[PDB]
């Protein structure tokens, strides 16, 4: 199976989430479009700069990169460290915040900030797309945003590698390897799913089953996952997602353990059995399947952990853009009428140069 | 300083014992006189058999010639040297590696000139002086190409460091092979002196004077023979190792020397060489200057045996025992040609 | 009111002064003597025109001792903890300045002597180096005397 | 060769820190916060007795071992062609075990006087024991290092003796005299130890 | 109160971490890429 | 003050222990392999 | 009455006992293995003989282990500060003695193994120096056994 | 009533037990593996013969794991400052025992691999010498386990 | 292309360090009971030192096996095995770290 | 009355009196003995002439020992703590001066070994140089005697 | 009025004086004497002509002793605590100045020995340089003679 | 032109050095509860020593790889590929630094 | 003759420290504010290390 057609769409999406900005996506789509409009002229022109040739040969790659970059800049609600306001920020009513036992709060507010509380009974409502711009100006944005970005990255990685593990089955089907199915794809995919699919549904279950009415002594995702992994089940100290979950977790761990023997030794044992029936080094093939199991399992774990590079680079870009805004274009704004604009001219010139 | 006399024994006690024993096994002047009292090559073999020498011509041809005894002495030297080297550790192993480079230079000189003039490698293999090794491939079967052997020297042969100054095969073809070996020899002496000075203990004290004398000797004789041959004076001065008393001053008068007496005048400023030149009367039928030098080197080797905590003992017995081999050879030559009137033309080994 | 560690500090000032000055002068004489012993063989006649850097290491010793004894003669028990500061600073300053000066004298004297073993003209430039060696020694002396008078 | 650099750095940092702290304390005229009596009165004499014994045996052990391997390497090297060496040079290893016994017996001398105190308040309680157990410490380290260097010298001298004995065994006693001298120095150590442990009493 | 024990513990942990990081830095500093193969050609 | 007297002797014992241990470690780091064999 | 922190001296003693003796045994194995590996190529008929110092290095480790386990048994919480001190001294002493005996055994082992490689006559002497080293190790054991009850 | 910071020493014991043995394994495998890459390259018929030092370093790592986990799972807040010190001693003991064992097995394994390159007779005795160092590590583990449950 | 596995192993050791690092970071507060915080310190030291050992082993063995496999192809599998062993060392450290993160 | 612990200065007086002196003594004997072993190899007739440095290293040992015995005789419990300062100073002085004379006689002695090995005439001169070093040792002694009885 | 430990500084003064001067003289006989043993092999006629640096090292010893005894006889129990500082500084000063002339003499004499061997005309200057070194010795003695009586 | 490839990427270590440094140069104040102060210390030293790690690896590996590209042009792909992991390491450092600077 | 330039220049390097030191001595007094002494130390060690 050629992986290129699937990469044609996977790779733009992953580069977009790794470059999650609206304006930058626009700028580099403009670049790619300039390549494509100047196709004929560039084709009939020598360009010793091999970097230019290599970027040009994959110019349509760059177009896909930029289209998905624009889409993710829209969903993430970021454009040069600024959120887009459709005026749908209908969650926190401020006069009603005053009505909510906040009387003359501004007198204290002259020195403090007074974080808004959860479930005042009068707030609620989502944003039409992406994140609410109120978080674009909030101080708790770091705690709020980065967490589900982490969990999001985990989700996306799991689905991608699921797709890969299905491609392996398709190879097995084509080349007529029933050993690579009974002891191969099926046991290993159930091994992976019995942990990570459970993790996914637990994540969504908490996201849609626990609210701020239960914030005080709420559950924790990582604590429950550790409880699963270590077979520790304390009576208290962690609010239980649903009754009977301990037995379910035990069963899931047990089947995950029961998946090892298949790839471990059931296939080479069948090879030896068939060979003896017909009558080939058992030890070498056994070692081969052993390294196959080890590489599969450790690769699965390492990949599942290393998909957080998604989160990492997304945060890196977001903070870099925010700093670039806070240092360069921020200082160009001043009460002074004419001198402010005259300084802002060269300040934004430097801004543009450094941004690109 | 305190660094020596403590760590040396811990990793070289056995080797010091072995080398001291082999030193004690040398042949005295009495043994030489007993050998001289032979008048035949068979009696020479018998006199060798009265000591640890001899007993090697057994199972060989009945007739005896010089080549046979020379080969046997060389083989014994090689066997004992390799046997000792194998049981060594890195501080000593670098030392023995320098001792082996002193002949690697001769062997690489031999190998070249068998490619500028197309000659097989394998026929040169036995011609190479033993201890040559060259067990590294791609120096063998070079398709007789100077570039191939040059690359093999730079890559596999450990002498690449010295060959950083003899490069590009331009010196390989244009400029005389003898001067190539002289320049490489000078560079090797420089590196060896620097490595010795790095080990600033009894080893430094032992080997700095010997190498100093060796370099000064070489510069003197370089100036002696350069008179009768075509050689630029600067091309003569560039072959003087800088690790000598001559380098701060004296090398220059040698560089502008023109006759034997001027070289004598240069040596006069240094009494250590004044005595050697005066003893070197150059008379028709007496010892010569290089014999005085060999005597100096042999007595310095004997001096080196007075301390226990130096690596110099190994170099010392190597030089003294090859000198013993040369003495044996010379006595054999005197016996063979019936020139017993010149039996007294060999330096004793004390 | 007047402490005893003030006198302690002043005495250590004079000590460290002559200490480091002696270090420098001894090192300078050592290196210079090795240089003369190297040069003397081919140039036996310049044994009388070679003592100069040794005399000038001597001058560094002059500086070290004059400051040391000057501070020593000013010692007392009724010290207000201030002249003790000045004495300590002066002494350590002149001391290590003499140390550095003697180090420079030794190295430059040995190198210049070895150069002069065949180059008599180098003598002039060698004196030109020697004067700045004494400049460093003088700078060791100056502020130390200033502090001894402060 | 980085290990000696590490040791030099450790020593330099330690010494500089001590100097800086001392000058600061002298500067600020701190009220005997560097109390010697505090450093010392809070010291159990059991340290003194036990560490005297431990050093006394340890240093003797180390030196005797050093002489043992030095002579072993030398004899093994010299016996390659002169195996008659082993007729004589074993007296050196006997001297090494002598280096051991000089320390072991004095460790027993100190250990005979191991006693308790049943005293808690330092001031003017157990005045004699304070000097006694200390002196045990001093004598113990003295005899220990004494036997140590005695073994070192005996060993390397025996190495020289063996490598001389390889070529001629007749001069072995002529070389062994200097080993006798080294033994005498070790005995000097033992005598100082007994003079330091003859007027002591514990608990 | 008992600031001495806290001072001792913090000093010990700080010097231990300093020792570890410094020895690792010294290690990684003096790596030897081999000084052979094409490096021969580049001398 | 600056120290708790209950642990000074312990500190000193640890210093002696680590001194002997670093002696041992300095000794063991001098170890190294063997080169090519004799025949 | 029982001084605080009374328990850490003796456990660290037993530690040191098994630590430094283990270092000595490691030294013996380290050097003797390099020996035997260098040797048996020429004379493979004496491999069984060259295990003589290796078992003895193991026995040094046994000395250290014996003391360590004894001290481990004899420890407690209600110490009058005396027993823990005896344990400390005994353990550290046996540990360092095991270290010394092990190193001597190791390098004498490699040397005498070479001596047997060339001259067979040196083999009994090799065993001689080894038995003396083992006597040293046994001193290390026995004096510590005395100290844990003194 | 318990002393403050009491339990910390046992956790440092677990950490030391773990890390020192980890260093031991990381070194015991590394130099042995370089020996394999240098020996098997020209005698590849002994690839399966010379994995024993690697398994032994694994055994040392397992000793480190089991002791560290045992100490980590016995932790609590209410310790009398006497369990924690014993756990610290046990942890340091086993950790450095594994460290020295790792060094010994690595060097002996490389030496024996090259030796059996030259001479197949070594193989069994080589294994025996490896058993010696592994059993040294086992002695360290004995004392550590006696201390951990004390 | 076949020579890149040890670099991936170095990445995996980076994972081993980072997972425990972020687990300690997000398990933090100002009013801690001084017990769990100390346990986090111990876990961090253990996992870091184990990762350092894995880094040393993977670098050295990767170089050795890479220079080996080119001459004798039979060394490649053994190289891979020792890489697995280095990963197992990292995992040992990770195990103790995770135990100390929730004790 | 006598401050407690006052005798500690005097006991380190005895120790430091003999320790470093004996270092020097056994160093000088050691190294001269190796040089004279080389002498024994190369000629036997000067063996009576070779005993010179050793007995004088013994004299260094006496320089240490007499002072050490004096201190160990003056030891007691209630010392004024003002004589013990002199005892300590005398001890460290005589000890390290014995170390001084020790390595001095050693290095000069083995220089004299080869010097007399090739030229019997230099025997008298090297004895003179040796005598200077034991004059230095007696210097190390006498101030110790002055202070220890002051 | 004067507190305890007041007499302490002076005795280390006298000690350090004699200590450092002994080191200097030991190094003076160190380098120059071995230089004689190496040089006079070929020139035994100058055996009587090069004893001058060795006796000069002796003179350094004399300086040390003289100041040491000067402090030894001038110390007391009821000392002002300032005289103790003066004696400490004076002794340190003269001792290490003796050490200074010590290594200066050692290096200069070692160079001058074989410098006289090759060119006998070097004798005109060698003793002059040694006189400079002894001038530094006198410098130390001058500071000692001022501080002690201060 | 190929010589510039590793150096533009070496600049990213300095970029990361600015990332948290400027952030905290802006977000600092006087009335600090003394615990966020510790968090910031940890973040800073973490990203800094990660800068050391990335610098060490980038220097030596870009060096060796550009030799091997000066000889064999095919080596270029592996040069870039192995270069990846150094910035992955620096990224890990910045990850922990931002978590601690915001936790 | 011409080669003496760096040595005169080395003398100038010592001028840089000496002159400032004399200035500190001029501005030094017993009753200092505990804040001018500070600037004296800062300036002195700074110019010294720069000259080194």
From Swiss-Prot, chain A:
Residue spans, topological domain Cytoplasmic: 39-53, 168-185
Q: Which residues lie on this side of the membrane: Vacuolar?
A: 20-21, 84-147, 207-251, 319-339
Q: What happens when the gene is disrupted?
A: Embryonic lethal. Knockout embryos die at 5 to 6 dpc, before gastrulation.
UniProt-annotated location(s):
Cytoplasmic vesicle, Clathrin-coated vesicle membrane; Cytoplasmic vesicle, Secretory vesicle, Synaptic vesicle membrane; Melanosome
Regarding tissue, the record states: Predominantly expressed in neurons in the cortex and in the dentate gyrus, CA1 and CA3 regions of the hippocampus (at protein level). Expressed at lower levels in astrocytes, oligodendrocytes and microglia (at protein level). In the cerebellum, present in Purkinje and granule cells (at protein level).
Q: What are the disulfide bonds? A: none
Give me the segments passing through the membrane. Answer: 1-19, 22-38, 54-83, 148-167, 186-206, 252-271, 294-318
Instruction: Give the family, as the similarity comment puts it.
Output: Belongs to the V-ATPase 116 kDa subunit family.
Q: What does this protein do?
A: Subunit of the V0 complex of vacuolar(H+)-ATPase (V-ATPase), a multisubunit enzyme composed of a peripheral complex (V1) that hydrolyzes ATP and a membrane integral complex (V0) that translocates protons. V-ATPase is responsible for the acidification of various organelles, such as lysosomes, endosomes, the trans-Golgi network, and secretory granules, including synaptic vesicles. In certain cell types, can be exported to the plasma membrane, where it is involved in the acidification of the extracellular environment. Required for assembly and activity of the vacuolar ATPase.
Swiss-Prot record, chain B:
Q: Which Gene3D superfamilies match?
A: ATP synthase (C/AC39) subunit, domain 3 (1.10.132.50), V-type ATP synthase subunit C domain (1.20.1690.10)
Which is one Gene Ontology cellular component term of this protein?
Answer: early endosome
Q: Does Cell membrane count among this protein's keywords?
A: no
**Top-level taxon of the source organism:** Eukaryota
Write out the tissue specificity statement of the associated record.
Ubiquitous.
| Sites bearing Phosphoserine, chain numbering | 282
Mind listing the GO molecular function terms for this protein?
protein-containing complex binding; proton-transporting ATPase activity, rotational mechanism
Question: What is the predominant subcellular site recorded for this chain?
Answer: membrane
Alphabetical list of InterPro entries matching this protein: ATPase_csu/dsu_sf, ATPase_V0-cplx_csu/dsu, ATPase_V0-cplx_dsu, V-type_ATPase_csu/dsu, V-type_ATPase_csu/dsu_dom_3
**Where are residues bearing Phosphotyrosine located in the sequence?**
269
**Membrane topology summary:** Peripheral membrane protein
Q: Which SUPFAM superfamilies match?
A: V-type ATP synthase subunit C
What keywords were assigned to this record? Cilium biogenesis/degradation, Cytoplasmic vesicle, Hydrogen ion transport, Ion transport, Lysosome, Membrane, Phosphoprotein, Transport
User: Where would you find this protein in the cell?
Assistant: Membrane; Lysosome membrane; Cytoplasmic vesicle, Clathrin-coated vesicle membrane
Q: Which GO terms describe its biological process?
A: cellular response to increased oxygen levels; cilium assembly; intracellular iron ion homeostasis; synaptic vesicle lumen acidification
Its biological function? Subunit of the V0 complex of vacuolar(H+)-ATPase (V-ATPase), a multisubunit enzyme composed of a peripheral complex (V1) that hydrolyzes ATP and a membrane integral complex (V0) that translocates protons. V-ATPase is responsible for acidifying a variety of intracellular compartments in eukaryotic cells, thus providing most of the energy required for transport processes in the vacuolar system. May play a role in coupling of proton transport and ATP hydrolysis.
Q: Which gene is transcribed and translated to give this protein?
A: Atp6v0d1
UniProtKB/Swiss-Prot annotation, chains C, G, H, J, K:
Q: What terms describe the molecular function in GO for this protein? A: P-type proton-exporting transporter activity; proton-transporting ATPase activity, rotational mechanism; ubiquitin protein ligase binding
Give me the Cytoplasmic side stretches, as residue ranges. Answer: 29-50, 110-126
GO BP field:
lysosomal lumen acidification; positive regulation of Wnt signaling pathway; synaptic vesicle lumen acidification; vacuolar acidification
Instruction: Point out the signal peptide segment.
Output: none
Q: Which domain of life is it from?
A: Eukaryota
**Predominant location of this chain?**
membrane
Membrane side Lumenal: which residues? 72-87, 148-150
Q: Which residues cross the membrane?
A: 6-28, 51-71, 88-109, 127-147
What the entry lists under InterPro entries is as follows:
ATPase_proteolipid_c-like_dom, ATPase_proteolipid_csu, ATPase_proteolipid_su_C_euk, F/V-ATP_Csub_sf
Q: Pull one GO CC term from this UniProt entry.
A: vacuolar proton-transporting V-type ATPase complex
Q: Does the keyword Ion transport apply?
A: yes
| Keyword ATP-binding annotated | no
Site note Essential for proton translocation applies to: 134
Question: Which membrane topology describes this protein?
Answer: Multi-pass membrane protein
Q: Where in the cell is it found?
A: Cytoplasmic vesicle, Clathrin-coated vesicle membrane; Cytoplasmic vesicle, Secretory vesicle, Synaptic vesicle membrane
> Which NCBIfam families does the UniProt record give?
V_ATP_synt_C
What name is this protein filed under? V-type proton ATPase 16 kDa proteolipid subunit c
Where does this protein come from, organism-wise? Mus musculus (Mouse)
The record lists the lineage as:
Eukaryota, Metazoa, Chordata, Craniata, Vertebrata
UniProtKB/Swiss-Prot annotation, chain E:
Task: State which residue ranges cross the membrane.
Answer: 3-23
Q: Which domain of life is it from?
A: Eukaryota
Q: Which residues lie on this side of the membrane: Cytoplasmic?
A: 24-43
**Under which name does UniProt file this protein?**
Renin receptor cytoplasmic fragment
Native source organism of the sequence: Mus musculus (Mouse)
Gene name for this UniProt entry = Atp6ap2
Region of the whole protein represented: 301 to 343 of 350
């Amino acid at each position: 199976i050629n992986p290129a057609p699937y990469t044609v769409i996977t790779f733009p999406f992953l580069f977009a989430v790794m470059f999650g900005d609206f304006g930058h996506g626009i700028l580099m789509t403009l670049f790619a479009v300039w390549m494509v409009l100047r196709e004929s002229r560039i084709l009939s022109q020598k360009h010793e700069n091999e970097m230019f040739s290599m970027v040009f040969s994959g110019r349509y790659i760059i177009l896909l990169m930029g289209l998905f970059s624009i889409y993710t800049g829209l969903i993430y609600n970021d454009c040069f460290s600024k959120s887009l306001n459709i005026f749908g920020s209908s969650w926190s009513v401020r006069p009603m915040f005053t009505q909510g036992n906040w009387t003359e709060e501004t007198l204290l507010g002259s020195s403090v900030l007074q974080l808004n509380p959860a479930i005042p009974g009068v707030f609620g409502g989502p944003y039409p797309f992406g994140i609410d711009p109120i978080w674009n100006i909030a101080t708790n944005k770091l705690t709020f945003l980065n967490s589900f970005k982490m969990k999001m990255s985990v989700i996306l990685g799991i689905i991608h590698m699921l797709f890969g593990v299905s491609l392996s089955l398709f190879n097995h089907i084509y080349f007529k390897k029933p050993l690579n199915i009974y002891f191969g794809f099926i046991p290993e995919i159930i091994f992976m799913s019995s942990l990570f699919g459970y993790l996914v549904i637990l994540i969504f279950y908490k996201w849609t089953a626990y609210d701020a009415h239960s914030s005080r002594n709420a559950p924790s995702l990582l604590i429950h996952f550790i409880n699963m992994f270590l077979f520790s089940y304390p009576e208290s100290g962690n609010a239980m997602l649903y009754s009977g979950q301990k037995g379910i977790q035990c069963f899931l761990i047990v089947v995950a353990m029961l998946c090892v023997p298949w790839m471990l030794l059931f296939k080479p044992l069948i090879l030896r059995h068939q060979y003896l029936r017909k009558k080939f080094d058992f030890g070498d093939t056994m070692v081969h399947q052993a390294i196959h199991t080890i590489e599969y399992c450790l690769g699965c774990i390492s990949n599942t952990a290393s998909y957080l590079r998604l989160w990492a680079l997304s945060l890196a870009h977001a903070q870099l853009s925010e700093v670039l805004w806070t240092m360069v274009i921020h200082i160009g704004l001043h009460v002074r009428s004419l001198a402010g604009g005259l300084g802002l001219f060269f300040i934004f010139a430097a801004f543009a140069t450094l941004t690109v | 300083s305190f660094f020596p006399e403590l760590y040396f024994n811990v990793d070289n006690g056995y080797l010091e014992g072995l080398v001291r024993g082999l030193k004690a096994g040398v042949l005295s002047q009495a043994d030489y006189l007993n050998l001289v009292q032979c008048e035949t090559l068979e009696d020479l073999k018998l006199h060798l058999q009265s000591t640890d020498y001899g007993n090697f011509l057994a199972n060989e041809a009945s007739p005896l010639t010089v080549s046979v005894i020379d080969d046997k002495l060389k083989e014994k030297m090689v066997v004992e040297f390799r046997h000792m080297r194998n049981h060594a550790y890195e501080p000593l192993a670098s030392f023995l590696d320098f001792i082996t480079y002193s002949y690697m230079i001769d062997n690489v000189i031999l190998l070249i000139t068998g490619t500028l003039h197309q000659r097989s490698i394998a026929e040169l293999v036995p011609k190479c002086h033993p201890l040559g090794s060259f067990e590294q491939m791609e120096a063998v079967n070079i398709a007789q190409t100077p570039a191939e052997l040059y690359n093999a020297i730079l890559v596999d042969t450990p002498l690449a460091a010295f060959f950083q100054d003899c490069i590009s095969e331009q010196d390989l073809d244009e400029m005389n092979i003898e001067i190539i070996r002289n320049t490489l020899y000078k560079a090797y002496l420089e590196s060896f002196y620097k490595f010795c000075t790095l080990l600033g203990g009894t080893t430094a004290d032992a080997m700095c004077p010997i190498l100093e004398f060796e370099a000064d000797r070489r510069a003197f004789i370089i100036t002696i023979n350069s008179f009768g041959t075509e050689l630029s004076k600067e091309d003569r001065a560039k072959l003087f190792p800088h690790c000598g008393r001559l380098y701060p001053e004296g090398l220059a008068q040698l560089a502008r020397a023109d006759d034997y007496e001027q070289v004598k005048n240069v040596a006069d400023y240094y009494p250590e060489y004044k005595l050697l030149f005066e003893g070197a009367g150059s008379n028709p039928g007496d010892k010569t200057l290089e014999d005085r030098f060999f005597e100096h080197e042999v007595k310095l080797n004997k001096l080196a045996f007075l301390n226990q905590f130096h690596f110099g003992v190994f170099y010392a017995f190597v030089k003294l025992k090859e000198q013993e081999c040369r003495n044996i050879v010379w006595i054999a030559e005197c016996i063979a040609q019936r020139h017993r009137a010149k039996i007294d033309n060999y330096i004793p080994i004390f | 009111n007047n402490p005893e560690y003030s006198s302690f500090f002043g005495v250590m000032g004079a000590s460290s002064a002559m200490v480091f000055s002696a270090m420098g002068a001894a090192y300078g004489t050592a290196k210079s003597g090795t240089g003369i012993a190297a040069m003397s063989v081919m140039r036996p006649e310049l044994i009388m025109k070679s003592i100069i850097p040794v005399v000038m290491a001597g001058i560094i010793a002059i500086y070290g001792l004059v400051v040391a004894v000057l501070i020593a003669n000013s010692l007392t028990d009724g010290i207000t903890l201030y002249r003790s500061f000045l004495q300590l600073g002066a002494g350590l300053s002149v001391g290590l300045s003499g140390l550095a000066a003697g180090f420079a004298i030794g190295i430059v004297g040995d190198a210049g002597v070895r150069g002069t073993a065949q180059q008599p003209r180098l003598f002039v430039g060698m004196i030109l180096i020697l004067i700045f060696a004494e400049v460093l020694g003088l700078y060791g002396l100056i502020v130390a005397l200033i502090l001894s008078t402060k | 060769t980085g290990l000696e650099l590490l040791y030099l750095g450790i020593f330099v940092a330690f010494w500089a820190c001590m100097v800086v702290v001392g000058i600061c304390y002298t500067i600020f005229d701190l009220g005997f916060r560097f109390d010697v009596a505090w450093f010392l009165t809070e010291t159990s004499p059991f340290m003194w007795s036990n560490l005297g014994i431990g050093l006394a045996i340890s240093l003797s052990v180390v030196g005797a071992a050093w002489g043992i391997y030095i002579t072993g390497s030398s004899i093994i090297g010299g016996g390659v062609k002169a195996p008659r060496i082993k007729t004589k040079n074993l007296v050196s290893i006997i001297f090494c075990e002598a280096v051991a016994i000089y320390g072991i017996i004095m460790a027993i001398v100190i250990s005979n006087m191991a006693e308790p105190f049943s005293a808690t308040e330092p001031k003017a309680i157990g005045h004699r024991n304070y000097h006694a157990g200390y002196s045990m410490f001093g004598a113990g380290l003295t005899v220990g290092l004494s036997n140590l260097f005695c073994g070192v010298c005996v060993g390397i001298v025996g190495s020289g003796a063996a490598l001389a004995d390889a070529q001629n065994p007749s001069l072995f006693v002529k070389i062994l005299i200097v080993e006798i001298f080294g033994s005498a120095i070790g005995l000097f150590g033992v005598i100082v130890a007994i003079l330091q442990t003859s007027r002591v009493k514990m608990g | 109160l008992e600031y001495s024990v806290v001072f001792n513990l913090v000093l010990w942990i700080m010097i231990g971490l300093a020792l570890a990081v410094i020895i690792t830095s010294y290690n990684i500093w003096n790596m030897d890429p081999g000084y052979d193969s094409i490096i021969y050609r580049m001398t | 003050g600056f120290f708790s007297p209950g642990i000074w002797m312990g500190l000193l014992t640890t210093l002696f222990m680590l001194f002997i241990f670093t002696y041992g470690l300095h000794m063991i780091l001098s170890l190294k392999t063997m080169d090519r064999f004799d025949d």
